[PDB]
């Protein structure tokens, strides 16, 4: 899965920012959130989020939903490595399994239940 953030900032610079931010906010996990390709859904003003490690994915759904102004009638799916993470998992658990080598967790969001559809 492609992230514009990774295309626009090179790896070394991302990695050195990730080191600084894990040290500054050790209790929080750094999350890059981006709209999935071909998604038909509100745009997200900002990509970079610091979130408590014990926040659940379900709770993160609520936070993102509100920022894109979705009615609870509308659907929202997260993807991490092309896979919908469990709603009950915590962002800390996601980070440990799926952080990337720049120390960031990458989450794509979409209105469709399959990434890239």
């Amino acid at each position: 899965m492609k992230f514009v953030y990774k295309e626009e900032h090179p790896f070394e610079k991302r990695r050195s920012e990730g080191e600084k931010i894990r040290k500054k906010y050790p209790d929080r996990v750094p999350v890059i959130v981006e709209k999935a390709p071909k998604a038909r859904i509100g745009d997200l003003d900002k990509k970079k989020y610091l979130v408590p490690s014990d926040l659940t994915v379900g709770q993160f759904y609520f936070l993102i939903r509100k920022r894109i102004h979705l009615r609870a009638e509308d659907a929202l799916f997260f993807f991490v490595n092309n896979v919908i993470p469990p709603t009950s998992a915590t962002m800390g658990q996601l980070y440990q399994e799926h952080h990337e080598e720049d120390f960031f967790l990458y989450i794509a969001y979409s209105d469709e239940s399959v990434y890239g559809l």
Partner: peptide
């Protein structure tokens, strides 16, 4: 370029509606 550090109340609102 700056990070969104979600506030303790918006976190608390999310823990309620969940």
């Amino acid at each position: 370029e700056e990070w969104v550090i979600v506030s303790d109340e918006e976190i608390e609102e999310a823990r309620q509606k969940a």
